């Protein structure tokens, strides 16, 4: 099964056929990409708010318009999937979902209301793909650059009526029914400790400081509970590399930040008429990213190394998180840098899958965002910025869907791409809930 | 080779698996969609400004979120393609293209500057896929709901430095080098007459009223010249149905409007805070669309009927045009209605292809547009409107990339889907220029 080695413009863009990305007929290579054999492992890479526009913007900037992302763009089977949510009251569609409902959709196979984690419109719990995988004896990994309590990584191990129920404090106010002290299953973080995936890596260390309002570890901090539960705590790249085993006896928990991990690139926020008033921006590497802080690619690599030892196979979800946060913050550089980050991760996952032969790798997003690539002389009503691309040209980015700073999400259907056994199930129009069923089946979960 | 009969939500959206579009594993069906055998015919359907977002909004409104367009969504092989243009001066990429440069890129295989038709950055002409097809003896069709002098349909038959050179008048001012009177090849319209496709159907009748500044037909109106050249002129549905033959000896020319043909659906323009201040809109059929005016579907059906008689095969380009004009005009209803129109056309094309077995059907857009599906309570900086979907829910549309009314184009990569011999060449990431090469090769043009 081949990966697209190179789909960059073959030559002189200005010349006939120079802009081509193909060098010949693809029928044969596609036929070699079709396999219904079982997938031993599954690696799901989620780019936060990374719809087609975000991908085009990051490529234009980092690789040039005729460029090619070695990871993100190298997946051969591609399609578009819908991700609408449901209105909790009426049960009718809610055309624009949040991170929480979408994450739930692919992690359980059931649509839900915005803000829900692991439950349907009736607040009924439904087992996630991770729980199912774990129950079947597979190894499981949940990796993210955001806070572990955030919608994407949280959805695999928590079942709460509101995504805001991070720890004890918020839960009692926002999710009384899930509140431990009220006989509920606990907050997001508590449920995460209970779920016991073999490898969990991310930010969100802050909430681990809260103390349990009830149970065996009542009075202890969630951090203290984790140690007591048998978890290996790691807070930096060095200690992470030191890890040699991660299992149900010694589950791994990497907390590398109080909240979200540091952004890759720094750059100014988009502003009114910024493409006109301000000069073109050139993004710059964040000094605080640190050699101490593991990158999404490193965490992905360590995760695969450890999960790999499980003879039965594994399920790993990886999230290039800061993308949509920077998209909300109308910050081009942060957004684009987070897509480059993801791409490096997708490469590590593709290398492993390629050599292993039985791994299904899927790269997609939870929902779409606000960013639009517009003409450079554009006089847009919202926030804009001009960027200096690898092509040595100017690209203007617009965020015009919200007045309240935070650029909202959108409902456009977006790209889903895959490689490996069963990847054919992402081609054409599909629904985000199909993704749950594809992974379940590919993995033979039953 | 199968078409997706149904990818609608299988059942109850609120229940587990109810929102699924798949009913089983697609590996086998995909294997049956792969064929490198030769394509006898090619039918290319272009939705003007019909990116993924436009497709999602038109589905939500006309079919419901869990709906399925029988045409547009039924194509099995899908991917995403880039359509960046080039800056005439520097030769560097111009991230947001217009309809002229994009049309030229798929019709000739060479990238050009915005505004050009059938020429590269150096103003050098390059032969179009239609000219090449005709030269090889295949029948050729050029159908559009727009004015025949507009960028998309014009690009197949004209070679001018500016898309504005409609007829003699504009050409002398805008394109002196193409100006007939100055020894040039002539305006868009004149060159169209010269190209002599077997079937040309659309609007733009107004310009045929101009008189030739030179040549054999100097002093005669372009309409008069057409008659004199041997063309069959048709201006309404009835006369169009009367046509039984269309060939090189009796080429067909249907001019059903002075400009663009009538929009299917009427509705109010999007406005500032319109989703808040104004009530939800329900689009209404346009009374002036007329039983006298053939629909894009009908024109597609007639064109396939006539082109069909050529033993050697045919190439047909069809354009659901009023879509981006209505997108520019921030008019949801017009835009959406144009997408439904196209869908009917794609259906007609897909039935023929399915039965014929050697026809490659491709559906895609020239470039992306402004439309974004946003939460209903959105307070966006631009124009917005709330619509009453088939789901009996509200969907809000936002146009916020321009202040100067006309909502500009965007540079996001968008969907390209196909069915038949060689459709595998649209899967994954490709460039709009690859489309020219795929068609040339499938058709074996040489
Ligand atoms: Mg998230
Ligand atoms: Mg056009
Ligand atoms: Zn998100
Ligand atoms: Zn267009």
Which entry of B33, B99, B107, B144 is annotated as an active-site residue?
A: B99
Nearest ligand to the CA of A51 is: 3
DSSP conformational letter for B60: H
Does A92 sit within 8 Å of B430, measured CB to CB?
A: no
A226: its two tokens: 């984790």
Extract the runs of DSSP E, i.e. beta strands, from B191-272: 199-203, 232-234, 252-255, 265-266, 271-272
Looking at the DSSP bridge assignments, the partners of residue B362 are B44, B418
Alpha carbon separation from A188 to A30, B365, B426 (Å, rounded)? 42, 44, 43
How far from the centroid of its chain's Cα atoms is residue B232's Cα? 24
B430/A389 CB distance under 8 A: no
Best mutation target, B412, B419, B420, to test chain A (most A CBs within 10 A): B412
DSSP string, B350-418: HHHHHHHSSEEEEEE-SSB-S-EEE-TT---SSEEEEEE-TTSSEEEEEE-S-SSSS---B---EEEEE
Q: A50 CB contacts (<8 Å, ≥6 apart)?
A: A320, A323, A324, A339, A342, A365, A369, A414
Helix (H) or strand (E) holding B146: strand B139-147
Given an 8 Å threshold on Cβ–Cβ distance, is A84 in contact with B60?
yes
Q: Strand, helix or coil at B170?
A: helix
Q: Exposed (0-12), middle (13-18) or buried (19+): which is B89, by Cβ within 10 Å?
A: exposed
Alpha-carbon distance of B408 to B98, in angstroms, equals 9
Strand B199-203 and strand B252-255: the pairing is parallel
* Rounded Cα gap, residues B138 and B132, in angstroms: 9
How is residue A181 written in tokens? 């002290």
CA B390, chain centre distance (Å): 26
Cα–Cα distance, A72 to A344 (Å, whole number): 9
Closest CA to B26 of A335, A336, A442: A442
Name the token pair of B418: 């196909």
The residues with which A316 forms a beta bridge, in sequence order, are A43, A141
Kindly state the tokens that stand for B122.
């150096």
DSSP B83: -
- Inter-chain Cβ pairs, chain A and chain B, closer than 8 A: 329
Helices B222-229 & B188-195 angle (0-180, nearest 10)? 10
Q: Residue A323's closest CA among A31, A8, A139, A58? A: A58
Residue in B375, B430, B441 nearest the CB of A25: B441
Say which of A33, A53, A99, A144 is annotated catalytic: A99
Chain A: give the shortest CA distance to residue B262, in Å. 27
Q: Spell out which residues of chain A touch residue B55, defining contact as CB-CB under 8 Å.
A: 413
Q: What are phi and psi of A412, to 5 degrees?
A: -60, 145
Cα B275 to Cα B5: distance, rounded to the nearest angstrom: 35
Three-state secondary structure readout of chain A? CCCCCCCCCCCCCCCCCCCCCCCCCCHHHHHCCCCCCCCCEEEEEEECCCCHHHHHHHHHHHCCCCCCCCCCCCCCEEEEEECCEECCCCCCEECCCCHHHHHHHHHHCCCCECCCECECCCCCECCCHHHHHHHCCCEEEEEEEEECCCHHHHCCCCCECCCCCCCHHHHHHHCHHHCHHHCCCCCHHHHHHHHCCCEEEEECCCHHHCEECCCCCECCEHHHHHHHHCCEEECCHHHHHHCCCCCCCCCEEEECCCCCCCCCEECCCCEECHHHHCCCECCEECHHHCCCCCCHHHHHHHHHHHHHCCCCCEEEEEEECHHHHHHHCCCHHHHHHHHHHHHHHHHHHHHHHHHHCCEEEEEEECCECCCEEECCCCCCCCEEEEEECCCCCEEEEEECCCCCCCCCCECCCEEEEEECCCHHHHCEEEEHHHHHHHHHHHCCCC
B147 CA to chain A: closest CA distance, Å?
Answer: 25
Please state, in angstroms and as integers, the Cα–Cα distance from residue B76 to each residue in A200, B237, B308, following that order. 37, 33, 24
Answer yes or no: do B60 and A93 touch at CB < 8 A. Answer: yes
Question: Is A289 in contact with A264 (CB distance < 8 Å)?
Answer: yes
Helix A332-356, helix A52-62: angle, nearest 10: 90
Ligand nearest to the CA of B97: 4
- Residue by residue, DSSP assigns B311-336 as TT-EEEEEEE-HHHHHHHTT-HHHHH
Cα B403 from Cα A438, distance rounded (Å): 44
Chain B: give the shortest CA distance to residue A66, in Å: 8
Side-chain-side CA neighbours of residue B171 (13 Å)? 29
Question: Looking at beta carbons, which residues of chain B come within 8 Å of A18?
Answer: 110-111
In this structure, what DSSP letter does residue B14 have? T
The CA distance from B390 to B371, in Å, is 19
Of A424, A437, A439, nearest to A36 by C-alpha is A424
Strand boundaries in B50-103, DSSP class E: 77-82, 85-86, 93-94
CA distance B127 to B118: 7
Is residue A432 within 8 Å of A414, Cβ to Cβ? no
Taking an 8 Å cut-off on Cβ atoms, the answer to whether A21 and B431 are in contact is yes
d(C-alpha A151, C-alpha A98), whole Å: 9
Contact in structure between B277 and B162 (CB atoms under 8 Å): no
| B98 CA → ligand 4 middle, Å | 6
* Helices B296-308 and B332-356, packing angle to 10 deg: 20
Domain ranges of chain A: 1-446
Structure tokens at A15: 């010349």
Cβ-contact B310, B42 below 8 angstroms:
no
Architecture of the domain defined by A1-446: 3-Layer(aba) Sandwich (3.40)
Q: By the 8 A CB rule, do B164 and B99 touch?
A: no
Other beta carbons within 10 Å of A245: 11
Plot region of B355 (φ>0 → left; ψ -120 to 50 → alpha; else → beta): alpha
Q: Is A239 a catalytic residue?
A: no
Contacts of B9 in chain A (CB under 8 A): 431
| SS3 (DSSP) at B223 | helix
Consecutive H or E run containing B338: helix B332-356
Pick from A338, A398, A285, A413: nearest CA to B95:
A398
Beta-carbon separation of B19 and A55 below 8 A: no
What span, in angstroms and rounded, lies between the C-alpha atoms of A323 and A368?
Answer: 11
Distance CA A50, CA A55 (A): 6
Q: Which residue among B13, B30, B428 places its CB closest to the CB of A7?
A: B428
Using a CB cutoff of 5 Å, list residues around ligand 4, an ion: B 48-49, 99, 324, 366
Residues B383, B26: Cα–Cα separation, whole Å:
41
Question: What are the CA-CA distances from residue A320 to residues A188, B274, B360 (Å)?
Answer: 20, 35, 38
Would you say B248 and B195 are in contact if contact means Cβ atoms under 8 Å apart?
Answer: no
Helix pair B332-356, B52-62: axis angle to 10 deg:
90
Q: Extract the tokens encoding B179.
A: 């100006």
Q: What contacts B269, CB < 8 A, 6 or more positions away?
A: B329, B330, B331, B383, B385
Q: Do B20 and A373 touch (CB under 8 A)?
A: no
Residue A385 neighbours by CB distance under 10 Å:
23
**Are B156 and B108 in contact, with CB atoms under 8 Å apart?**
no
CB hemisphere CA count around A87 (13 angstroms):
15
Tokens standing for residue A34: 């079709």
What are B353's two structure tokens? 């292809």
Q: State both tokens at A88.
A: 């909790």
Alpha carbons B78 and B434: distance in angstroms, whole number: 14
> How would you class A14 by CB atoms within 10 Å of its CB: exposed for 0-12, middle for 13-18, buried for 19 or more?
middle
User: From the list B30, B403, B437, which residue is nearest A22 (CB)?
Assistant: B437
Chain-centre distance for alpha carbon A330? 19
3-state secondary structure of B64: coil
- DSSP label of B7: -
B25/A441 Cβ within 8 A: yes
Q: Are A414 and A383 in contact (CB under 8 A)?
A: no
For residue A432, give how far its alpha carbon lies from the nearest alpha carbon of chain B (Å): 8
CA-based torsion, B149, B155, B157, B162: positive or negative: positive
CB contact under 8 A, A411 and B60: yes
Residue B306's Cβ-side half-sphere holds a number of Cα atoms within 13 Å equal to 30
The angstrom resolution of this structure is 2.6
Measured in angstroms, the CA of B372 and the nearest CA of chain A are apart by 6
Chain B environment of A106 (Cβ under 8 Å)? none
Q: Please choose, from the candidates B99, B48, B53, the residue with its C-alpha nearest in 3D space to the C-alpha of residue A372.
A: B53
Residue to mutate among B2, B66, B428, B444, with most A CBs inside 10 A, is: B428
């Amino acid at each position: 099964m081949p990966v697209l080695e190179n789909r960059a413009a073959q030559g002189d863009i200005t010349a006939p056929g120079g802009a081509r990305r193909l060098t010949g007929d693809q029928t044969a290579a596609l036929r070699d990409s079709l396999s219904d054999k079982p997938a031993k492992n599954i690696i799901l890479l989620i780019g936060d708010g990374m719809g087609d526009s975000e991908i085009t913007a990051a490529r234009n900037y980092a690789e040039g318009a005729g460029g090619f992302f070695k990871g993100i763009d190298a997946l051969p089977l591609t399609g578009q999937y819908t991700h609408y949510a449901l209105n909790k009251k009426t049960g009718k569609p809610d055309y624009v979902t949040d991170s929480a409902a979408s994450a739930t959709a692919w992690s359980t196979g059931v649509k839900t209301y915005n803000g829900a984690l692991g439950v349907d419109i009736h607040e009924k719990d439904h087992p996630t793909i991770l729980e199912m995988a774990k129950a079947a004896g597979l190894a499981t990994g949940n990796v993210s650059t955001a806070e572990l309590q955030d919608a994407t990584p949280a959805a695999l191990v928590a079942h709460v009526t509101s995504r805001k129920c991070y720890g004890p404090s918020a839960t009692s106010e926002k999710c009384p029914g899930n509140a431990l002290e009220k006989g509920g299953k606990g907050s997001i973080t508590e449920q995460l400790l209970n779920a016991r995936a073999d490898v969990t890596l991310g930010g969100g260390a802050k909430t681990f400081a809260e103390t349990a309002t009830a149970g065996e570890w009542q009075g202890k901090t969630l951090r203290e509970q984790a140690q007591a539960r048998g978890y290996q705590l790691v807070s930096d790249a060095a200690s992470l590399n030191s890890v040699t085993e991660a299992n149900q006896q010694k589950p791994l928990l990497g907390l590398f930040a109080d909240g979200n991990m540091p952004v890759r690139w720094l750059g100014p926020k988009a502003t009114y008429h910024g493409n006109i008033d301000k000069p073109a921006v050139t993004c710059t590497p964040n000094p605080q990213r640190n050699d101490s802080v593991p990158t999404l690619a490193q965490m992905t690599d360590k995760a695969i190394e450890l999960l790999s030892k499980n003879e039965k196979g594994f399920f790993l979800q990886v999230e290039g998180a800061s993308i949509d946060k920077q998209d909300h913050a109308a910050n081009p550089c942060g957004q684009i840098g987070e897509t480059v980050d993801l791409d490096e991760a997708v490469q590590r996952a593709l290398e492993f899958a390629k050599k292993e032969g039985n791994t299904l790798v899927i790269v997609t997003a939870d929902h779409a965002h606000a960013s639009q690539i517009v003409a450079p002389d554009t006089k847009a009503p919202g926030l804009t910025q001009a960027l200096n691309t690898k092509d040595g040209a100017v690209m203007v980015m617009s965020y015009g869907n919200s007045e309240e700073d935070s650029q909202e999400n959108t409902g456009s259907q977006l790209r889903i791409a895959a490689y490996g056994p069963h990847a054919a199930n992402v081609v054409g129009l599909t629904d985000q809930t199909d993704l749950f069923y594809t992974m379940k089946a590919a993995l033979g979960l039953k």
